[PDB]
RNA sequence: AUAGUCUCGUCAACGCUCGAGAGGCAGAGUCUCAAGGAGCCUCCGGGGGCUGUUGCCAUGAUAUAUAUGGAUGAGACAGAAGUGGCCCCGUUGACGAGACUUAGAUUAAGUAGGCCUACCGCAGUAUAUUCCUAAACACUAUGAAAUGACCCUAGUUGGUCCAUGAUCAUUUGGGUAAAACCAUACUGCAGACAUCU
């Protein structure tokens, strides 16, 4: 089938910068389903705003093809607030699907360290380095 | 040389293009063209933010958690204002139109009350259709005598949902709608979604805004200073007042007919094609401002051909009571009268009595 | 929810159940966002709109 | 802290 | 010093020698108004009055013996009530 | 094909047509047209100010060189300041404020006392400090030091170097905004420290640095050209009317039968008014230019569009100040029907 | 002095810090010469930019 | 006197989704729910499919529960708490209360006094002058430049300025310190509805 980076980039909200190449955005993918097996996840609204509001660190990913526009539309600075890195990508069933859920979610929240579980930290420990560079070529950009 | 010749090329008025009330200027007819303009007042669009926001409506998009009293009070809370009101009634569940009059537009909300009302609604049936196009018949079988229009849109048969426009003037209606459609099918069917599409006067296409963009607009004017973005989301009330017909008022005259009086052919400067007697009629400057709904007292004919009578009587005032200067009783038959009444022609409430002359028996017609 | 738009060329609303049209354009959602009268993040909204020029009136 | 006189001048 | 004394602003970072202030406080401060503790003992006067309506800083010409990296973030500075003149002032009027 | 006409006669077609037909009288002339002595007493020099000399210097020196009678400016005196500087030429003094409310525009180097830890805090520093500001006037400035507030409408990072520690910004902003307070603040937000290195104005009003900017040297060789080779070419090149000044102002068309009358301080009639602006409203501030484009008056509208399309009679404006001179058009009032019939 | 500057296609000014842009073309500074009232070289600068043509009003 | 308008609080009548709660919405705290797991089959420890229209949670709503939905959320604590956080029908008539008026809509160059003055419109002038002197800013005259000059607890190779004149010394001499508007006084020009064919 085709792709769902290519499919939803006409439905692409305009104030989604940065908007995340498809090598970028597959490593992006990839993290997030390592995160959500560590269960180092806040997804949707409500958790990231409050995660955010809380003082968590790690890097946000929000979906493009999000309507109404009022949903997300006050992410981006609030992540500038707290210093955390943002990156937007084309599809929200594709972050849904990386993000463990059946359903789409609009925004998914990666916290390091945030599970209490030992498993939960030697699988951030191995999802580690690809989060790590994520969030350098995130800020590289 | 570059000197602007005789008869050279130029814009003409066109008078389709001007806003508001004001549109279609030229098909009202002339009583008169000879008056005084008096430096009062303001248009409409070019009001300053006080009285803008004191004479303004907002075409909203309810959300679907809150009720639209809720929704009323919540702007009254985000604007700061004395008022808020609102003339249709949406169910908490539906989304759609909403429009909300703040302060002065609220005197306009009984007025617009009885006006058509659209929606949009998902019929969702309990079961598969053995034809699809019935569905559209039974739709034709609830349509008339109550549900003025209705058009089916479309209808997937195997997700076994069906979105249709309607006009009707409740959401209960719908409720309703929906459960008789499934009646007349045999399979059964309730209401998925409901949404109004047009509420009155206005509808969905005309500058529609939400909450997020009242609280983002006063946020602006709050703390940066900035008037474009709450008055981009914001609509003078004449907006609701563009069906009925207008009649124009000498600007010696509104001041008068805002305190209460009868307004009289010296007042009348234009008037429009096809006023018919007691139809209601809205009272306009030249500037474009709704002095007030009133009551057209004679027909188009009659306004064409007398000298002197009472041209309408004001049903709701809408424009503030001091907005203009007090210019009446300076005419001449005005004058003459006071001198009457000073010189005992007349008595002290102005009545004909035995000391009247014969000739201002002939002339004069008290209208009292 | 169920109900999609899309907008024609005279700039009205087109209802559809689909969420991808024949044409293949990708359909909105009809219903606004939830609002609450608490919300504290217009300064966020405002901010991020007007980076790109999509606050009305700018 | 007064008005030049030149400033303020009383009528002929 | 005052009995009074109302809470003006927040530990933002030091600045060539000054203590930069987010102002918790909705009013704006006098020039040269005299900074408090809760102590009522004063570490300095407001130096200069910047930023946007919204989000309004001030900066503190800290006195003798009152150094701006001693004091950290979240350490609050307080100031007298009749140092306080409305933000109404400042914007034209009607 | 009203686009390449001059000044304030360009779209003129665009103008609601009052009355099409008049007849001409054979005086004045075009703005662009006049001879030189009423072009440069009518005249405005958008000059490429320099650094070193203050801007009141450089008005002293272009009316010393020009020989004027009084020339002027409307500029903030921050020194060391580059740029559009509009210096106004005898009656074009009184226009010196009628472009206030378009705004200036800068482009400013700040210098940052030390170098960031993140480069891109400077730029979202910047866009802290866009919208209504608390500003307070330098010492330098002639201006009393009271807190004021202050609209930077868009601002722009062009560039920063880091290890240069320099910073290249673009900022649009309200008349009366001070950019080394701006570059001071910026300092203070970063918390490293900084101040304005360089500025330079690259819009002041409606003029901008596109718009026939010149140069001191320019203003000086064309004063010697016109007095050794009796030319007036390069001096009616430096110099602009007045008129250009008068741009964004809704237009008035008056008759010439009705000039000087509006010369000698009447109100404007009805029957002297030719063309006007979609849109003009009570109250406010328009120009009454001839069919030549040449501005009469800065005036105050009396009637909005209704009335100046329907109404026959009564007053269209009230000058509120005269630019041109009186008798340069004759003396035509009393001879209208109306005036002559009560007359009679 | 630093800023510099070179020309756009719209035939504007860009504004740089840098003496030679990234695609080559060397910049010119922003700032006028400066500028004394008792100069007393208009004729020849006037003779040379006549040569060329560099007269504005020429 | 009469009549109208605006702001209000009661009764009656007629309609409606039939209207005050164990209610709803917004917000705060705690907890639960997102196929994040398990098995199988392939491909090169990881990737792709199958179980899986499965499972987990909510929902009886005019209702198919073999159903409809699930973070652009739902449920429990909570029939609670709180409301000095908000919301809970419309039209007409009558009564009572507070106000504003009681209005015929003027003026094709103004207002007030005794033919003339004063005010009003526009345009100008003045708002200290001369001499000496202090200071600031910029220039200019003379001499000094590539081993150029200045600053910093000072350099694994610091930074800034610099013939487009830096930084030093003598004083060589002149320049700038405005303009616009308000207020007061004075002077002058007009009282103009704009024909021209």
Known sequence: ?141 | ?368 | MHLMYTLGPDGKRIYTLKKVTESGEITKSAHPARFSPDDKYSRQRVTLKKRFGLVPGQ | ?12 | ?94
């Not at chain 2, 008056?35 to 926001?53: E, H, M, N, Q, V």
């Not at chain 2, 849109?153 to 459609?181: P, Q």
């Open chain 4, 1 to 12: 802290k007064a008005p030049n006189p030149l400033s303020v001048k009383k009528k002929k």
């Open chain 1, 1 to 141: 089938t085709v792709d769902n980076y290519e499919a939803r980039m006409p439905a692409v909200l305009p104030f989604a910068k940065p908007l995340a190449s498809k090598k970028l955005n597959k490593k992006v993918l990839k993290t997030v389903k390592k995160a959500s097996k560590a269960k180092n996840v806040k997804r949707g609204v409500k958790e990231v705003v409050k995660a955010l509001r809380k003082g968590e660190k790690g890097l946000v990913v929000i979906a493009g093809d999000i309507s109404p526009a009022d949903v997300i539309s006050h992410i981006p600075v609030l992540c500038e607030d707290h210093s955390v890195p943002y990156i937007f990508i084309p599809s929200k069933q594709d972050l849904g699907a990386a993000g463990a859920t059946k359903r789409p979610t609009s925004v998914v929240f990666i916290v390091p360290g945030s599970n209490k579980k030992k498993d939960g930290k030697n699988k951030e420990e191995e999802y580690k380095e690809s989060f790590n560079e994520v969030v350098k070529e995130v800020q590289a950009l």
């Open chain 5, 1 to 94: 010093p005052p009995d009074t004394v109302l809470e003006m602003g927040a530990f933002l970072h030091p600045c060539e020698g000054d203590i930069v202030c987010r102002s918790i406080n909705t009013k704006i401060p006098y020039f040269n108004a005299p900074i408090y503790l809760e102590n009522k003992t004063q570490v300095g006067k407001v130096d200069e009055i910047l930023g946007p309506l919204n989000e309004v800083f001030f900066t503190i010409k800290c006195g003798d013996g009152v150094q701006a990296t001693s004091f950290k973030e979240g350490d609050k500075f307080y100031i007298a009530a009749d140092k306080l003149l409305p933000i109404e002032r400042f914007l034209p009027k009607p």
């Open chain 2, 1 to 368: 040389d570059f000197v602007i010749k005789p008869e050279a090329a130029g814009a003409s008025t066109d008078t389709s293009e001007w806003p508001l009330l004001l549109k279609n200027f030229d098909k009202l007819l002339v009583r008169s063209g000879h008056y005084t303009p008096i430096p009062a007042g303001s248009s409409p669009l070019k009001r300053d933010l006080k009285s803008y926001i004191s004479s303004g409506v907002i075409n909203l998009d309810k959300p679907s958690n809150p009720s639209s009293h809720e929704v009323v009070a919540w702007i009254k809370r985000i604007l700061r204002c004395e008022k808020t009101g609102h003339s249709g009634t949406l169910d908490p569940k539906v989304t759609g139109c909403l429009i909300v009059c703040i302060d002065r537009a609220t005197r306009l909300v009984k007025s617009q009350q009885g006006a058509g009302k659209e929606y949009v609604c998902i019929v969702r049936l309990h079961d598969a259709l053995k034809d699809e196009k019935d569905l559209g018949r039974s739709l034709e079988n609830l349509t008339g005598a109550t549900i003025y229009e209705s058009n089916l849109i479309e209808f997937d048969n195997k997700r076994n949902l069906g979105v249709f426009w309607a006009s009707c003037e409740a959401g209960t209606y719908m409720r309703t709608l929906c459960v008789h459609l499934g009646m007349l099918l045999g399979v059964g069917g309730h209401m998925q979604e409901l949404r109004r599409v047009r509420s009155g006067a206005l509808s969905e296409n005309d500058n529609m805004v939400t909450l997020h963009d009242v609280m983002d607009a006063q946020w602006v004017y709050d703390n940066t200073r900035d008037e474009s973005y709450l008055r981009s989301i914001i609509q003078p009330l004449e907006t609701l007042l563009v069906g009925y017909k207008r009649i124009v008022v000498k600007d010696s005259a509104v001041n008068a007919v805002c305190y209460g009086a009868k307004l009289m052919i010296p007042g009348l400067l234009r008037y429009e094609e096809g006023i018919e007697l007691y139809d209601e009629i809205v009272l306009i400057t030249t500037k474009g401002e709704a002095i007030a709904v009133a009551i057209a007292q004679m027909s188009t004919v009659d306004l064409a051909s007398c000298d002197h009578g009472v041209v309408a009587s004001v049903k709701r005032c809408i424009m503030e009571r001091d907005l203009y200067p007090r210019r009446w009783g300076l005419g001449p038959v005005a004058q003459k009268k006071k001198q009457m009444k000073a010189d005992g022609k007349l008595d002290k409430y102005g009545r004909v009595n035995e000391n009247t002359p014969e000739q201002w028996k002939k002339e004069y017609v008290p209208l009292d």
